[PDB]
Amino acid sequence: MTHSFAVPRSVEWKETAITILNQQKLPDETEYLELTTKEDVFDAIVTLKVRGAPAIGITAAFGLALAAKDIETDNVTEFRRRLEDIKQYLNSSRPTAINLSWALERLSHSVENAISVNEAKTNLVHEAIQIQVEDEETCRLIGQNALQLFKKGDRIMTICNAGSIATSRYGTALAPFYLAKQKDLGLHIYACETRPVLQGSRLTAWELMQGGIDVTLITDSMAAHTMKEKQISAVIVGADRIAKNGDTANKIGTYGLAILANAFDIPFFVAAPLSTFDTKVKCGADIPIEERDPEEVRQISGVRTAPSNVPVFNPAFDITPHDLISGIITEKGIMTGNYEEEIEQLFKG
Amino acid sequence: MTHSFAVPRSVEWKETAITILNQQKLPDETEYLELTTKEDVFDAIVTLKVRGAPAIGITAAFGLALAAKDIETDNVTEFRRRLEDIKQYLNSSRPTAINLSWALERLSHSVENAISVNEAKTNLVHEAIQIQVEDEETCRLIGQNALQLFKKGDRIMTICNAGSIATSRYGTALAPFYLAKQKDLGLHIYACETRPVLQGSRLTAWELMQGGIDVTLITDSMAAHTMKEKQISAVIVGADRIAKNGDTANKIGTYGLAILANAFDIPFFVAAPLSTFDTKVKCGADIPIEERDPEEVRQISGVRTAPSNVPVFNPAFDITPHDLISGIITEKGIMTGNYEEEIEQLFKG
Numbered sequence: 001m002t003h004s005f006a007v008p009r010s011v012e013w014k015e016t017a018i019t020i021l022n023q024q025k026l027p028d029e030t031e032y033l034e035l036t037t038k039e040d041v042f043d044a045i046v047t048l049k050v051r052g053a054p055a056i057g058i059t060a061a062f063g064l065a066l067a068a069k070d071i072e073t074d075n076v077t078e079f080r081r082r083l084e085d086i087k088q089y090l091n092s093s094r095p096t097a098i099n100l101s102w103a104l105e106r107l108s109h110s111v112e113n114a115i116s117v118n119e120a121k122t123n124l125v126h127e128a129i130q131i132q133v134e135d136e137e138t139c140r141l142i143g144q145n146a147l148q149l150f151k152k153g154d155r156i157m158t159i160c161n162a163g164s165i166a167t168s169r170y171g172t173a174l175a176p177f178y179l180a181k182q183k184d185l186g187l188h189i190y191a192c193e194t195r196p197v198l199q200g201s202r203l204t205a206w207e208l209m210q211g212g213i214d215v216t217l218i219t220d221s222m223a224a225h226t227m228k229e230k231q232i233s234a235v236i237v238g239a240d241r242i243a244k245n246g247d248t249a250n251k252i253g254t255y256g257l258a259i260l261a262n263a264f265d266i267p268f269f270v271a272a273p274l275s276t277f278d279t280k281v282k283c284g285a286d287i288p289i290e291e292r293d294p295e296e297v298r299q300i301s302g303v304r305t306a307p308s309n310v311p312v313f314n315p316a317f318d319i320t321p322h323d324l325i326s327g328i329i330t331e332k333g334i335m336t337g338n339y340e341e342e343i344e345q346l347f348k349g
Numbered sequence: 350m351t352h353s354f355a356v357p358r359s360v361e362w363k364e365t366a367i368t369i370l371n372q373q374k375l376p377d378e379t380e381y382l383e384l385t386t387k388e389d390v391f392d393a394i395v396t397l398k399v400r401g402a403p404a405i406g407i408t409a410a411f412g413l414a415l416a417a418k419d420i421e422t423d424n425v426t427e428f429r430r431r432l433e434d435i436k437q438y439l440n441s442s443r444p445t446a447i448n449l450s451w452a453l454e455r456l457s458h459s460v461e462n463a464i465s466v467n468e469a470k471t472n473l474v475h476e477a478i479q480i481q482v483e484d485e486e487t488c489r490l491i492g493q494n495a496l497q498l499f500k501k502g503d504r505i506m507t508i509c510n511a512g513s514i515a516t517s518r519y520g521t522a523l524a525p526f527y528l529a530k531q532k533d534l535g536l537h538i539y540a541c542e543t544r545p546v547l548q549g550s551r552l553t554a555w556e557l558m559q560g561g562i563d564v565t566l567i568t569d570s571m572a573a574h575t576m577k578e579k580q581i582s583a584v585i586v587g588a589d590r591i592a593k594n595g596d597t598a599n600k601i602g603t604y605g606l607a608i609l610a611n612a613f614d615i616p617f618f619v620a621a622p623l624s625t626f627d628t629k630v631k632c633g634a635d636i637p638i639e640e641r642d643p644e645e646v647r648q649i650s651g652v653r654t655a656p657s658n659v660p661v662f663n664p665a666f667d668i669t670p671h672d673l674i675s676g677i678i679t680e681k682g683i684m685t686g687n688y689e690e691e692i693e694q695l696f697k698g
């Protein structure tokens with residue numbers, strides 16, 4: 001079962017259905033759903049039955065393609081007109097993760113020159129699938145490129161869950177941990193539980209234990225004391241959107257970790273494929289930050305941890321300025337210097 | 350009841366019983382338990398049925414005095430000798446907060462000249478009560494001293510629960526919020542839920558609303574995004590033990606809060622009575638950091654939030670270096686630096 005990370009679990013195309021692992025039922029139960037309509041896909045994304053930027057893009061894509069089937073039309077222009085309506089719909093699920101819009105826009109552009117309806121449908125399916133297989137390679141290369149940053153026995157801190165179920169498989173930020181365990185370098189990782197949704201203790205602690213990876217859980221507030229007491233070597237995280245300048249919007253807490261890392265002068269690393277980059281957003285300040293249902297903070301896995309009417313500020317992401325970032329790892333390699341210049345030279349083709 | 354903070358709820362002496370608020374049940378329900386044995390006081394402390402440094406001291410003191418009544422002996426020296434076994438037992442309760450040892454030690458000293466066993470016993474009670482009545486007055490001064498630091502309409506962030514039920518009454522870090530409320534000084538409090546025990550979520554958010562204080566709940570990981578997005582103007586926390594150095598031992602998370610505060614150039618304040626200072630240790634490294642059962646982090650109320658056997662690191666406190674401290678508020682007023690020399694002057698009265 002220590003190989004489960006190398007197999008697709010988050011989302012699978014079934015031609016007539018889209019099967020997704022239900023992440024809200026972990027760590028307790030491992031259940032799979034059958035999404036059949038875009039309402040289902042919209043619901044899975046919005047309520048986090050499926051989460052993690054890359055995997056959300058893939059699902060949204062399979063979602064648009066599955067839904068385009070029942071678009072019984074004569075015209076291709078009309079087909080596009082109808083297709084655009086379903087796209088806007090699934091795109092309004094969650095704001096921050098660029099991958100969502102990026103996937104949808106990719107499938108949209110794949111039928112711009114389409115000549116027939118059937119050719120379009122096929123295009124959508126093929127383009128969706130290609131997106132998934134492509135994500136698999138990048139994750140694989142991201143895992144490789146990043147491990148270069150760690151020496152044997154390093155203690156790495158991380159936040160949220162940027163692993164095998166947040167992507168097609170393998171993962172991004174957690175990917176190098178699966179490889180290091182392959183190359184016997186005794187890496188020790190400290191996973192922040194990631195409140196309020198707890199992606200760290202519920203998914204991260206879950207999948208790494210599954211892979212026979214050494215992982216210790218800690219609350220988020222314990223970061224600082226842990227960097228000191230445990231002398232962690234570095235901090236590696238994924239991302240939901242990287243601005244043209246390096247500003248990375250990621251799970252809420254990341255920004256606090258980056259400022260903490262700098263204080264302890266511990267390198268802070270961000271790993272994410274090109275699909276998560278947004279070259280048209282100038283800086284992090286222009287990145288939409290999603291604020292979710294407040295009961296997220298008032299309750300947990302079922303019952304009360306706060307009075308009912310207490311007002312809460314529930315942002316699901318923050319922004320880490322590129323200057324607190326020691327490096328960003330992508331499928332093409334590791335950037336360090338001037339990110340604006342690096343981001344660009346990176347999108348040569 | 351807004352004025353509920355101005356009345357003792359944490360611990361109350363009853364000659365043949367000690368009544369406390371069962372803090373485990375908040376905010377769900379408000380329940381008082383009767384403590385009648387040394388084992389009870391010991392249970393309530395270890396299980397956090399009563400918590401917060403001063404309340405722990407006041408409560409421990411009453412237990413010692415209470416258990417001393419069972420001591421059968423005409424020999425005063427045999428009496429004190431026995432008082433010492435009960436004292437060690439009560440003291441090995443929890444290690445980090447000095448108020449426990451301080452109160453227990455203060456009571457032991459009250460009988461060292463005792464000529465009679467009945468005198469000594471009476472002595473212990475009077476001394477216990479006096480510690481309680483004195484904490485109330487110190488809380489008052491501190492709320493009134495820290496209020497000088499805040500202005501109308503400014504946002505303040507705090508952590509854990511250094512208030513009304515963690516002390517005799519009124520509280521410390523939270524004291525000024527109540528005092529500001531009675532004079533209509535518009536203050537917006539931002540409370541960190543404080544994982545894994547959630548004293549901020551279940552206690553602070555509870556007593557502040559119950560006082561008409563404008564409070565907003567956030568997770569511990571939201572602090573960085575909040576200090577910037579809400580333009581936080583300051584941070585005020587309580588304390589479990591301050592070394593002659595000024596190094597403050599407080600609820601896990603304080604340390605990171607102090608460092609996030611320094612980055613954002615936001616003043617950081619520690620509010621705590623003299624009984625919380627420890628001049629016997631020269632710095633934070635000399636302060637015992639209690640590590641609690643890892644279950645507090647893997648689950649809550651029987652609802653697990655992680656794999657049941659994932660390794661955990663559960664420190665309930667961390668150390669904030671005096672350098673990251675803008676000021677320390679005591680019944681004596683405010684200290685802004687050169688702490689050693691300063692608290693040194695402090696204790697010569």
Ligand SMILES: CSC[C@@H](O)[C@@H](O)C(=O)COP(=O)(O)O
Nearest residue numbers: 051052053160162166238239251
């Ligand atoms: C492949 S994970 C990349 C990020 O999107 C992820 O780490 C994250 O920070 C938030 O994911 P979410 O969908 O918000 O739960």
Ligand SMILES: CSC[C@@H](O)[C@H](O)C(=O)COP(=O)(O)O
Nearest residue numbers: 400401402509511515587588600
């Ligand atoms: C008036 S309480 C101040 C402190 O003792 C501080 O708030 C704290 O950290 C609490 O410890 P706890 O573990 O809850 O007992």
